[PDB]
RNA sequence: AAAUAUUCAAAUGAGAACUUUGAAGGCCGAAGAGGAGAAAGGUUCCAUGUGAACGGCACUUGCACAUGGGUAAGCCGAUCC
RNA sequence: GAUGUGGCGGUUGACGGCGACGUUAGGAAGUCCGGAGACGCCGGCGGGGGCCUCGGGAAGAGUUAUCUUUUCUGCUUAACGGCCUGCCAACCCUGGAAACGGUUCAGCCGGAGGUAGGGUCCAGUGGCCGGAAGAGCACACGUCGCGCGGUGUCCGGUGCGCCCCCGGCGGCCCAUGAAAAUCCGGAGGACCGAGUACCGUUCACGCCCGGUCGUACUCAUAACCGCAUCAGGUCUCCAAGGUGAACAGCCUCUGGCCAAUGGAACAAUGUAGGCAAGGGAAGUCGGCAAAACGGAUCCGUAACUUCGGGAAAAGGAUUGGCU
């Protein structure tokens, strides 16, 4: 674009410092902090990070639990699915 | 110099409660006066937005005073407490639960 | 357009210490020559013809030019010390006393 | 703020101010004789008064 | 009292910066942006232009569609001044006018 | 002083009371008007017309110790 | 001997580079050598008297010594929390 | 704290307004629940006050050989109250949008109804009036004096100005930024409601009362702390004008000193400050500091690099008065 090759966020923050490996993890989780997410409730691409582990949708006002940096997590999907399956079979 | 401002009473620190605003006298002299902090908004608990129809002042003003009965309140229920579009949401909830409850009860016994 | 003038009638008053306490023909005489001198000759803010009549002990100048206001108090200060060791024998007031001026202005 | 208001200190300041007065001429006769050159008159610029 | 001012020297100098002058590199330059930060000047481009365009649409001299594209171009800063925008508005109207007569 | 009133009747009712009064007539000013000092609060009635103003001053109760100033 | 710096005339007094007044020259240069409050000191503030000691010069002057006076709050603070 | 007068309430515990909400009253026990007290820091932006800039105008002052309708200065309006008034934020109603719109420093208004039209609200603030000129300020005159009589004291303008405030936003975080006295509200409806009176007594008006303690003044190159009238140190508020980015330096206003023992010569030698032809670090353990470069605009910009930087690389040129 301008004087930008790839993108940064935190690469630009450093200067020369920190290093190539270190920026890989944190770049992914800081873009996630910035990242708009779609609410389950309203469906708008509103939801933003209220705090660590806390997400809040501005429009509907709905506050939701989630991962630290990101809306959900791979682990969260796994945990809910097994619980729902166990509940479904037992209730039968 | 320029007509100077000094801690006019006592308390010689620039605290939040002793933020000041300059006033000019009929003498033509500048001095600041002690002014209490500007009011926030009273919130509605569910939405978190400011509560309409309610003037907001220091609690000292807002209690048994020069003000008449009306100025503390709005006529509707939850006048100072909930915002008005918030009040109707709980009237709707009250309606839904009662009508649903009779339907649930008769279903279970049968 | 219309009528615009600055009609100042010049009054000489006897008050204040610094010599004696007297009047003189010279004070009203000085008024005319200096008015013409400072105002007249110009590229700038004026452009005028100076007309004068003289009363019993007042000289009245009506000039087809600038005002007669703030400007006339300012010009009189200049006249004082350019010539003649006096002045401090006048500058009374209360009311529009001293030299009274009436401003004729164009309508707007 | 005031200029330490507390009464306990305040009374001592009053007492010491009264105490820091010169010896009065007459008494030197009504002691018999002995040089009554006080001692308990102090000056503020030098020393320090403890409470 | 005790002496006097020195407004008279200063005011004439200010009047000589009201009238061009003495604004070559040497005398006029302290540290870089700080004389007038230039951020506010960029915002001034947004503000002046958006008032003019908004006034035109709501008074009805242009259509809403003409406003819509023009507003986005102002954000891009494709117009740097009061003028050049003036030509653009009139050009837009003329092109759409030529289109409209062709359509009917 | 806190209040200016325009109702003649309201002024008159206060005026009959014991509390006090003072009255001002002078040049055309902010200052000029008929003032009634009630104990906590002061009501001021500005009578614009000269004739009516003079009558208002005449209407003043004889027992009350009103200040001419 | 750091801190840009004094000088002239008058007043007074036994006595005046230094006091006091004028005139003049300057200086701090409004993040002040400024107007005030905190803290601290405790009467130092001011009058009047006034040079024994003290202001490492001087001195009739003093933040000195002597003699007097002065700090008034329903609303400012403490208090209350 | 006492009360009396008026009004409030017989639809028994007020109406009007589409509503948002308006107003001189307009029951409310136990209890409940909320909100107020009540909140970080930085950035830019908005509006306000004062200060700054400036024209006209009414007074006094100065320049005043000479020139200048020039220059300087007073020109003020409170707490508190009335009436009126704030946009952002927010909310109500109309209406039904695709050639989708308005709009933020983060995409947020509107598809759970916008843009647009008409309202409503928070009342910082200004206005005009009350305060309040009866004051104060500047003049003239008077000694008629410990004080006399008169006026005039007004009306505009401008913004990246300066300071502070206040508003609503935005950045930040594995950091998400107190609590209480103080305190009203609503929900709650028990209980008590009368008529020639009883009920309201969060209303207006009237009557009385308000105790305890501190208040001098300095706040520092001399009232504090370092034995001390010590060049040191010591928390905070106000912050003019120019040049200029400047709350830099320098000069000055306003405020404050003129007391830094004084005089004479002004030697070497010191200490502190400058400059030197030609040469240019050969000096020296060593470029130690003196000295030079320096601000900015334009041009130009390296091997290398975690691609963010180096970078103001280097290196050059330019820079006034005035019209």
User: Could you write out the DSSP letters of every residue in E34-89?
Assistant: TTS-SHHHHHHHHHHHHHHHHHHHHHTSS-HHHHHHHHHHHHHT---SSSSHHHHH
**Rg, C-alpha atoms of chain A:** 18
- Residue D21, CB, less than 7 Å from strand G? yes
Helix (H) or strand (E) holding A28: helix A20-34
With CA atoms as reference, report the closest residue to F18 among F65, F59, F57: F65
Total beta-carbon pairs less than 8 A apart between chain B and chain D? 4
Sign of the dihedral through C-alpha B70, B75, B77, B79: negative
Contact (Cβ atoms closer than 8 angstroms) between residue F44 and residue F33: yes
DSSP, collapsed to helix, strand or coil, labels residue F5 as strand
CA of A50: nearest nucleotide by C1' is H176
Query: Chain B, 30-59: which CBs lie within 7 Å of strand H?
Result: 30, 32-33, 37-45, 49-59
- Residue D6, CB, less than 7 Å from strand G? no
Compare all CA atoms of chain A with the CA of B46 and give the residue at the minimum distance. Answer: A61
Write out chain A residues lying below 8 Å of B48, CB-based. Answer: 61
Tally of CB atoms within 10 A around E94? 10
DSSP state of E27: T
Rounded to a whole number of angstroms, the distance from the CA of B29 to the nearest CA of chain A is: 49
Write out chain B residues lying below 8 Å of A61, CB-based. Answer: 46-48
Tally of CB atoms within 10 A around C90? 18
Residue B86, both tokens: 């918030």
Rounded to a whole number of angstroms, the distance from the CA of A66 to the nearest CA of chain B is: 21
CA of B4: nearest nucleotide by C1' is H238
Residue B66, both tokens: 């020069």
Alpha carbon distances (Å) from C60 to C7, C28, C99, C100: 7, 9, 10, 10
Contact (Cβ atoms closer than 8 angstroms) between residue B99 and residue B73: no
Nearest residue by alpha-carbon distance to C1' of H82: F3
Q: Which residues of F4-38 are buried (b: 16+ CB within 10 A; e: fewer)?
A: eeeeeeebbebbeeeebbebebeeeeeebbbbbbe
Q: Indicate the annotated binding residues of A for Zn(2+).
A: 39, 42, 57, 60
> Angle E39-59/E85-103 helices, nearest 10 degrees?
30
- Residue E95, CB, less than 7 Å from strand H? no
Give the whole-angstrom CA distance, residue E83 versus residue E48: 11
φ and ψ of E93, to 5 deg: -65, -40
All chains having 3 or more CB pairs closer than 8 angstroms to chain C: none
Strands laid side by side in the C50-54 sheet: C50-54, C59-63, C5-10, C101-104
Residue F1, both tokens: 């002083």
- Spacing of D9 CA from G35 C1' in Å: 31
Q: Which residues contact C82 (CB under 8 A, 6 or more apart)?
A: C34
Whether B47 has its CB under 8 Å from any CB of chain A: the answer is yes
Query: Chain B, 28-67: which CBs lie within 7 Å of strand G?
Result: 34
The contact set of A with B (CB < 8 A) is: 61
Give the whole-angstrom CA distance, residue F51 versus residue C72: 43
- How many residues make up chain F in this entry? 69
Give the whole-angstrom CA distance, residue B72 versus residue B64: 10
Give the whole-angstrom CA distance, residue E33 versus residue E35: 6
- Spacing of B12 CA from H256 C1' in Å: 24
Q: Which residues contact C60 (CB under 8 A, 6 or more apart)?
A: C7, C8, C9, C10, C52, C53, C54
Give the whole-angstrom CA distance, residue E69 versus residue E63: 11
Residue A77, both tokens: 């999907």
Give the whole-angstrom CA distance, residue F44 versus residue F31: 10
Contact (Cβ atoms closer than 8 angstroms) between residue B83 and residue B75: no
């Amino acid at each position: 674009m301008t004087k930008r090759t790839k993108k940064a966020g935190i690469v630009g923050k450093y200067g020369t410092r920190y290093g190539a490996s270190l920026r890989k993890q944190i770049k992914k989780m800081e873009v996630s902090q910035h990242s708009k997410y779609f609410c389950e409730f309203c469906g708008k691409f509103a939801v933003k990070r209220k705090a660590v582990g806390i997400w809040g949708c501005k429009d509907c006002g709905k506050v939701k639990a989630g991962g630290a940096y990101t809306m959900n997590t791979a682990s969260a999907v796994t945990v809910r699915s097994t619980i729902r399956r166990l509940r479904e079979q037992t209730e039968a | 110099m320029v007509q100077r401002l000094t801690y006019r009473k006592r308390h010689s620190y620039a605290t939040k409660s002793n933020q000041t605003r300059v006033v000019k006298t009929p003498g033509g002299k500048l001095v600041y006066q002690y002014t209490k902090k500007r009011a926030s908004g009273p919130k509605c608990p569910v939405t978190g937005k400011k509560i309409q129809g309610i003037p907001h002042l220091r609690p000292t003003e807002y209690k048994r005073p020069r003000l008449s009965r009306n100025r503390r309140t709005v006529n509707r229920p939850y006048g100072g407490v909930l915002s008005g579009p918030a009040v109707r949401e709980r009237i709707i909830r009250a309606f839904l639960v009662e009508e649903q409850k009779i339907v649930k009860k008769v279903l279970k016994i049968q | 357009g219309g009528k615009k003038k600055g009609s100042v009638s010049f009054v000489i008053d006897c008050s204040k210490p610094v010599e004696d306490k007297i009047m003189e023909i010279a004070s009203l005489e000085k008024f005319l020559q200096e008015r013409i001198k400072v105002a007249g000759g110009k590229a700038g803010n004026l452009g005028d013809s100076v007309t004068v009549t003289r009363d019993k002990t007042k000289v009245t100048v009506t000039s087809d030019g600038a005002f007669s206001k703030r400007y006339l108090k300012y010009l009189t200060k200049k006249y004082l010390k350019k010539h003649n060791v006096r002045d401090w024998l006048r500058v009374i007031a209360a009311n529009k006393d001293r030299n009274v001026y009436e401003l004729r202005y164009f309508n707007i | 703020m005031p200029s330490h208001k507390t009464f306990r200190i305040k009374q001592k300041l009053a007492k010491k101010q009264r105490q820091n007065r010169p010896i009065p001429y007459w008494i030197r006769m009504r002691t018999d004789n002995t040089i009554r050159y006080n001692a308990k008159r102090r000056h503020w610029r030098r020393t320090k008064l403890g409470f | 009292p005790q002496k006097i001012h020195s407004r008279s020297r200063a005011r004439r100098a200010h009047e000589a910066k009201q009238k061009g002058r003495h604004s070559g590199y040497g005398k006029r330059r302290g540290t870089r942006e700080a004389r007038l930060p230039t951020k506010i000047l960029w915002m001034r481009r947004m503000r002046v232009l958006r008032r003019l365009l908004r006034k035109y649409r709501e008074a009805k001299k242009i259509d809403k569609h003409m406003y819509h594209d023009m507003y986005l171009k102002v954000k891009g800063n494709m117009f740097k001044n009061k003028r050049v925008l003036m030509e653009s508005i009139h050009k837009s109207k003329a092109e759409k006018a030529r289109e409209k007569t062709l359509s009917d | 002083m806190p209040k200016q009133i325009h109702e003649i009747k309201d002024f008159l009712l206060t005026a009959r009371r014991k509390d006090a009064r003072s009255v001002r007539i002078k040049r055309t000013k902010d200052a000029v008007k008929f003032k009634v000092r009630c104990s906590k609060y002061l009501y001021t009635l500005c009578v614009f017309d000269a004739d009516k103003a003079n009558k208002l001053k005449q209407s003043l109760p004889p027992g009350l110790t009103v200040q001419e100033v």
